[model samples]
Every structure is written in structure tokens, then in C-alpha cells.
Target: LKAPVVVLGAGLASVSFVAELRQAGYQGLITVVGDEAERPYDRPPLSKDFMAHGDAEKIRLDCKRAPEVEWLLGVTAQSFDPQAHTVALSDGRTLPYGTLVLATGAAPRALPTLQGATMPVHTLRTLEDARRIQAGLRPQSRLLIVGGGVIGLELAATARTAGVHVSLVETQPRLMSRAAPATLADFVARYHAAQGVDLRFERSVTGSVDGVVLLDDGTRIAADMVVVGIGVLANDALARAAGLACDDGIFVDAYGRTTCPDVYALGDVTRQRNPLSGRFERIETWSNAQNQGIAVARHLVDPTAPGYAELPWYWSDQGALRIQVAGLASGDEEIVRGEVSLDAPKFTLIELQKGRIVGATCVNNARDFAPLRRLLAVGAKPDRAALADPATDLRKLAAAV
Candidate 1:
């Protein structure tokens, strides 16, 4: 059947998948629909280095992966009909497909309070959003950032680098309270505060009024611009409307197949089984986005191929700090490989669930990241003393298993 291979959302996942399909010699009409006006580009750098350099060309994903692939740019998929095997676009076009791939990714959680605010307010997701914020990150200008999460902290660090006065508002008691251990979060807090960031916690923004921001805890801060990186919600509305199993994110198998036949999803929009936790989770990291897309495309071309199921891992760059995390950050037992003291902190925290290595957090410690990842992958149970000792060679320990 030479019907059509239609994909929704032309981000990294879609690019990777389509590139693989062509590489595997799948000779079918491929169409990718994207809401963004621009070509597919990376998002991670949007909050990091791109803020300073504003390099769009370097961040652009290869659409040339296959020139034969038709890209319907600047249009969104409004509805999906599984029974009819078609998708309705926002621009009044219905495309029929034999195979459908959804890689819509996620949308930044925009704060309602800042919606009609007088000053500049933004949620960093697209290049346009980055450019707007790039202009606002001026020297000595106050930047009020809401959320202590990865995106918020990264933006804060970037803003501070530009000599922009940065202030963070976190509802939680500490940064990454939900995702990171308190100690590691505190270490990050110290790092940012030391950089002259006005870090505020356990408070919420009420609204913007009279040329200033009012907080829930009796405070008012005037800011030149506001950026809300609170979090992101999956763009699975089309899939959910089509009756694909979803809880914010679409539920898919290891091969990226949704509950509906011929319909699959990947990247930030999928909730697939976690190999270690055995629970359905959204692996929302760059590594997962690229690998899962490649894996799914390969498997679709040849079913004998292995399914995509890898341990979750992430890397966050906040100014001078490089934070790499894998698996869960919290566990029954924890081990420190280096000094985590607030001043000049550089360490790796290994987490253990019972006796098996379940997670690791590397703070400015790239040396231990790979070894820790290998050990966590095989569920290696190294000696507690050796794991905690800085003199011990983690690479040798990883080799043993």
C-alpha cells in the first residue's frame, strides 16, 4: 500500500523518525505537519547558549534528512480520526494516512496572571519566544522568573550572565523540590544566589498591577520582564480527542504504538513503560526524544529490531554548573562521591533502592556521570564504602559489573 506516512509536529522526534524511515528505504509518501512557522530546530539551547549567541542555524534539525518528505509547516493538527485514518489540519485540510506518527512535543505552562500584564511576559518554547526574551535580558534590567525548575533556573542563569538582574519565584520550599533531592537543590540555590540572583521560595505570584508584581506572601517586585518556565504540558489533545489512552500524555508501547492501531507517538507526548520502575512515564529528555524516534522508525521498517526502552536520564546547564541526572534522585540510601558543600560544590550523589543502584545525580562532576550511568543500567551493587570514597575509581567498579 502506497497510501501515506503522516506525522504530526515536526520537532526533533519527527525529524529523527523521518530520517530513519528514509535511511531504512521506506518508499512511501511521508508528510510532516508542524504548528511552528520555522523549520524544525532544537529547543534545549533556546534557554541556554542561544540566549546569548542567538544561533538559529546551528540549532536547526536536518529537514534535508529526506527532501522527498513533504512538510506542511505553519499548520496544526486539530483533530485525528482513527476510524477514517486521517488528520484534519487547522488550515482546513484533511490528510489520509496508512501510518500516523505523533511527536507534537510539549507546550510551556504559561502563567495566567502574566497573560495581560503590562510588561513583557513569555514562555520559552519556540525560537520566536527565545528571541523576544533575548531582547528583554538586558544589562541591569530586572528579570522576574517564575518556577525553580530546570528551564526557569537555566534562564535565570543565562539572564544573570548578560548582567540582567534576575529574581526567581518558586512555590516550593526549595528548587526542584519535586524532582531533585533537597541537598542537591539547596546546592543549586546557593550557586545561583551566589551569582546575585534574588532567590525567593514558598511563595506564589498573585498578579501584575500598577507596574509591579504582587506575591502571595506580602511582597511586591517591579520587573522589566517576566518569564514563566513553571513546567510543560504534553500536546496530546489530538490523540486524546481520537480516543488514544492519555493522562496529559499519550500512552504508547515500547515501539511507540498508541492504543489505536496504525497510530504511534513519541518524544514528550508519550507515556511509555519505564524499564526500571515498570511504570508508565513520559521520558522527556533530549536523549529519549532522539533515540526513541530512531528506534520506532527502525522497528516499523523491521519488526525484528529491538524495542526502545532505556533508563531515563537528563542534563541541565545552568550557567557554570552542569547537572546530569539518571533514574530517581531519591531512594532509601544515598552515597556521596565528592564534596557537596555549598562552596565550590562538585560531587555525585548515588541513590540506592534497598541495595540496588537506582539513581544518580552528578553536580559539576562529569567524571562520575558515565560510570554511574553504566552501574545504574546493570543494577550493580558496589560496596558502600568504595562508592562513597573519592579515591575509589568508579570506572573500575563499573567494569566489574
Candidate 2:
């Protein structure tokens, strides 16, 4: 007799896993437990389109595609007993399972100094948080965004378009220091500046007093609403307490298998091996959450299926520009294609290591990016001069390689 399967956390990863399982004829008893009262929904729009239009229905995940499962919403998993094969919930209920899937996603890292502020200090991760932040954004309102990462920049662009004054402060010297390269970051910085955003680099929030934010440089800025997008920390406490191996993130293999038997993890919570770098990392992107979830589900249903080794790819839309990044960022050499100036901001920077295309960063150029990404996936090395030529047909270049 097979014990029931229990999935923890109801984010995209968990939902996708369940959907794939159903599609692949997984018809055993399955249950999904999530902390949020709302059903699983898409999160990327919390900072992008949702902020602009405030359409709740558009952001909701299409649960119709998922399998019918027992859903325990708004209940937190208090503890996990791996040896006993049971999970205790906050509601004083215990769930026994034959297979346990951990999809407990990451949480936003809050600044201690920003706490206990007179005004609202928000982080855009959930639908509720987005609504609260969205309510305060008005024509003449001042929005102070901490951190220049992808989330902060997306919100800044959204708020500015909504006629709100956006002031972005980054502790680092550049926008998206950890995400974007220097060339691309500078281009993004200029775009925001032109939109009347007060971009402050090499700046840190010292403290907040009576709705006023004080910077490290002794500058006080009055903000009607504050949003912190510093980053996120993995919710691996449960995994570690249950005797599962974990570091900054829960270590998992290509198949989402943890150290413990019958326990699997995926999405932002798992520090899985990167196909490009050959090192463990939390991709933390929407595509990773979706594709990895499906891959893991397929592997679970059929062990003989190929192991998950999808290349890391992510996209960010800010105002008029769309940025797409794929594979590893670091490489021995770089090949630039087309121009990246304000007049014609359309180009792709290919990362090459020993003549193999390792990675690429595309800005406002989807046509070139499609072929270049395909080339990278197959280890195809095209002529450097042809790659740099704007007149070259990228599809032909990709095929010739």
C-alpha cells in the first residue's frame, strides 16, 4: 500500500509539480499545504503589471491545469519528522506521507533599521503585500525604494509611470550589481534617470524617523511609502531541523532529491547544480520555478526520464526595455553584437569561454537573443565578426554554427 504524497508550500513550484504529476497520470492520493489563504498564483507580476493595473484575476495561477488534490490553505507546517514520515501543522494537525515535497520558497530579507518605522515599510513578495504597497501609490506620492535589484527597479518604473515620485537608493555603486553587468546596468540607470527617478548609488539607509529616511551620507528624504527589495533568504529552517542537509540553501541534485530518502525539494528553496557553472546555486527565477517543478515531477513519475539540467534563463521588463539573461555570466571573453546606446538600445553580449558560448545578456533585442541562446545551448561557436555584425541574420548564424 503506497502512503499518500504530501506537498508543502503552494507557490508556483508546488502547483506546477502537481499539475505535471496529473498530466503524467499520477493519480494517487495527493495533498497540498500552503501558508497563504489564497490559491497559488504568479509572483513576478507583483512588481510589474500588477503594480500598474492592480488586476488580481490576471495574476492568479490557472489552477484548472492542476490535479484535484486536498488543499490545506492558510495553514503553516510547524515541524517535520523525517524518520516518522509526518508533518505537524500550526493547526494542531499531523499529516503522514510516503513522499514529501518541500517547496517552501524564500522570504524577503528585511532591514533591521527600517523596522518600527512610523510609515509602512513594504516588501513585494505576496499578493497581499503588493496590494498594500499599491494602495499608497498616488499621483504626487513619494516612493522610496531600497536596493536597486530587479524588484526595486521594476517597482520604480511602475510607480514613475503612475505619476509617483520614485527615489531609488542602492548600497552598491550600480543598479542590479549582482544581476546585471556594468554596461547593461549603466544603460538601465540612464533610462530611470530620464524618467525622473532620483537614482542614488553607493547609498545605504541608516534609519527611518517619523516617515523620513536618513541615508548614510547624512541626507534625509521624506517618503510617503517605503519598499525594501534588498533580496531574500531561503526558508531552509524546516529542512535543517528535520535532519536534511542544508547550507544557505537546501542542497539538491538535478532530480530535486535531497539527502533524506523520499524527500524532494525544488524552486527557490533548493541550491541545485547549475548546468553552465557546474556549481550549486539558487536560480531564484520564475522560469526555474516552473520548469524545474515539471522536470522533477516527470522524474518522480518515471525514474528513467532524463535528469533535469535546464539552463538558467530569466527576463525582466522595466518600462520600455526588456532584459533577458541566460546561462552563466562569467567567462574568459565577451562578444558584443549591435549597439547599446540610448539612441538604439538593442544588443546582445555573448559570454565566451575557450571559444564556447557560455552565456548571453540581451537588452531590447529578442530576435537576436532567440538564436544566440539556441547556439549557446548546443555549444555552437559562430564567427566573432559575423556575431558582431548587425546586418547578419542571427537565425542563419545559429544554423551555420
Query: Candidate 1, residue 228: CA error in Å?
Result: 0.7
Each candidate's TM vs. the true structure? 0.95, 0.96
Query: Residue 105 lDDT in model 1?
Result: 94
Model 1 misplacement above 4 A: 1-3, 64-67, 342-344
Candidate topping TM-score? 2
Report the lDDT tens digits of candidate 2 across residue range 1-401: 13487989999999898888888778898889999999678999988999889888898887677757888999999888988999999999999999999999999999988877888899989999999999999898999999999889999999999999999999988898875667778889998999899989999999989889999999998999999999998888999988889986789998889999989998999999988878888878998889999999998988889878788888899998899988877688788887777775787888888888888899998877888788888977777787777778878877876
The number of clashing residue pairs in model 2 is 0
In Å, residue 203's CA in model 1 sits off its true spot by: 0.4
Note the Cα lDDT for every prediction shown.
0.88, 0.88
Q: Point out where model 2 deviates above 4 Å.
A: 1-3
How many collisions per candidate? 0, 0
lDDT of 1 by residue, 160-275 (tens): 88999999999998998656766689889999999999999999998998668989988898998888888889998988888889997999888899999999999999988888
Q: RMSD for each model, in Å, please?
A: 1.8, 1.6
List the pairs of residues colliding in candidate 1.
none
